[PDB]
Amino acid sequence: FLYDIFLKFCLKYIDGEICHDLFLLLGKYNILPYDTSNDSIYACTNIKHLDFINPFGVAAGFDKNGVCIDSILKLGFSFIEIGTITPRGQTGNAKPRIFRDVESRSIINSCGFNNMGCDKVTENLILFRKRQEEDKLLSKHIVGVSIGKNKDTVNIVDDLKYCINKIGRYADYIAINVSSPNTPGLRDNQEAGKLKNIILSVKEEIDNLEKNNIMNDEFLWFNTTKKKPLVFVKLAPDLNQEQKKEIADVLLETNIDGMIISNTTTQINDIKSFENKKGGVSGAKLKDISTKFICEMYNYTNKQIPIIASGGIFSGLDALEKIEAGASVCQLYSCLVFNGMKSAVQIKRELNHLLYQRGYYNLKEAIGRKH
Ligand SMILES: Cc1cc2nc3c(=O)[nH]c(=O)nc-3n(C[C@H](O)[C@H](O)[C@H](O)COP(=O)(O)O)c2cc1C
Numbered sequence: 001f002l003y004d005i006f007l008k009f010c011l012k013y014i015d016g017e018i019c020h021d022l023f024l025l026l027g028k029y030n031i032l033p034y035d036t037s038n039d040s041i042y043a044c045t046n047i048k049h050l051d052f053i054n055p056f057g058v059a060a061g062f063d064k065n066g067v068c069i070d071s072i073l074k075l076g077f078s079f080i081e082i083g084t085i086t087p088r089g090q091t092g093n094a095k096p097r098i099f100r101d102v103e104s105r106s107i108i109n110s111c112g113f114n115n116m117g118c119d120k121v122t123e124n125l126i127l128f129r130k131r132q133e134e135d136k137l138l139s140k141h142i143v144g145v146s147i148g149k150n151k152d153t154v155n156i157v158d159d160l161k162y163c164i165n166k167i168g169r170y171a172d173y174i175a176i177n178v179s180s181p182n183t184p185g186l187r188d189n190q191e192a193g194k195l196k197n198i199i200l201s202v203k204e205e206i207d208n209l210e211k212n213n214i215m216n217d218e219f220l221w222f223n224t225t226k227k228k229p230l231v232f233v234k235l236a237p238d239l240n241q242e243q244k245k246e247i248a249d250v251l252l253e254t255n256i257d258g259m260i261i262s263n264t265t266t267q268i269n270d271i272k273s274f275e276n277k278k279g280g281v282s283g284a285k286l287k288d289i290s291t292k293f294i295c296e297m298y299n300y301t302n303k304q305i306p307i308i309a310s311g312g313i314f315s316g317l318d319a320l321e322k323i324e325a326g327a328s329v330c331q332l333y334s335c336l337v338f339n340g341m342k343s344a345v346q347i348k349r350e351l352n353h354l355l356y357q358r359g360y361y362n363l364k365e366a367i368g369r370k371h
């Protein structure tokens with residue numbers, strides 16, 4: 001609650017990244033709040049054998065380097081997507097690179113995959129997994145890893161392969177980021193043919209980790225599921241019916257475990273304070289766009305591919321809209337920026353309360369209910 005006093009200050013006066021680094025730093029030293037209450041079993045959700053204690057996680061780009069996993073999750077989230085990571089560390093584009101307009105509760109960013117690199121982040125998650133093994137409050141929480149290419153890498157597959165070999169065995173799922181606007185030509189790989197080759201290589205590389213073991217599978221996968229990481233793809237709102245039916249076909253043929261919808265958009269033009277700035281736009285103004293993209297991709301894939309919702313989710317209603325559109329689970333980013341800690345507690349009660357008034361035995365009853 002006290003942090004919500006701090007927030008309205010950090011938003012008025014302080015740069016975003018400085019506020020970001022402070023929040024990560026508070027969590028590094030375990031001085032963030034904890035939600036220790038039972039989540040409604042009536043709101044759990046799943047994607048194949050991934051069982052989510054609740055339908056809300058933290059989107060990629062929040063804990064890029066996995067230095068703050070414990071404390072953020074202990075805040076009341078069921079899972080977190082770290083990354084996007086690249087094989088070697090990158091500083092990203094030139095600072096300043098994140099801007100926020102409170103009036104529209106929106107953000108624009110051109111970070112450019114700044115991270116300390118796979119090797120160092122993997123060591124951070126190894127440490128986390130050892131703490132998770134000992135703490136019940138973290139015992140059922142899922143950690144996925146978002147992976148992308150270095151800015152100057154020519155072949156994306158080569159970057160994706162390296163990450164899997166090094167970190168694949170500690171992740172519960174892998175998110176393929178082909179949708180960042182701030183990496184040049186990165187959304188050209190969303191093309192159907194290259195995407196197929198990428199996908200099938202990701203799934204194949206994961207499959208090879210199993211085969212060359214002398215140990216059991218309990219000991220191979222040092223993660224919550226103690227299982228092979230799933231393979232998800234983060235699609236961009238910057239697609240088109242054609243290219244959305246191109247990709248949908250690839251997804252159907254390659255048996256992708258799920259698709260994350262969506263990344264930021266480069267199509268919001270009515271924000272006065274962000275005019276002439278570069279980067280992708282996040283937040284509420286992306287909500288309706290993202291929801292429409294869920295409907296299309298949920299429809300184009302005949303409901304066979306689970307959808308992970310992302311984009312402008314702030315309230316319980318917003319989440320239910322994503323869920324009723326076809327999403328199984330939701331990810332938050334901007335909501336945490338503008339609402340802070342309460343975000344998880346608040347959105348979970350709103351969703352539970354709304355499920356009660358609108359008549360649902362459980363959450364799965366609501367998935368895709370607009371269709
Ligand atoms: C500052 C910032 C950094 C982000 N970094 C990443 C990233 O590294 N990898 C990724 O896949 N998505 C990244 N995203 C996209 C978000 O995860 C999410 O898809 C999008 O911002 C929608 O979130 P919203 O709920 O705030 O609207 C980033 C977004 C922002 C605002």
Ligand SMILES: Cn1nc2c(=O)n(C3CC3)nc(C3CC3)c2c1Cc1ccc(C(F)(F)F)c(F)c1
Pocket residue numbers: 003006007008010011015016017018019020022023024026098100107336337338340
């Ligand atoms: C106000 N605020 N601005 C943010 C921002 O710009 N980003 C990035 C552009 C992506 N991320 C976050 C969130 C993870 C921090 C921002 C927050 C929440 C916030 C809460 C509390 C404090 C503290 F004072 F308790 F430490 C703080 F410093 C910041």
Ligand SMILES: O=c1cc(C(O)O)[nH]c(=O)[nH]1
Pocket residue numbers: 061109110111112113114177179180181182263264280281
């Ligand atoms: O997927 C992504 C990545 C970035 C970034 O790291 O710059 N930014 C976004 O808006 N989306």
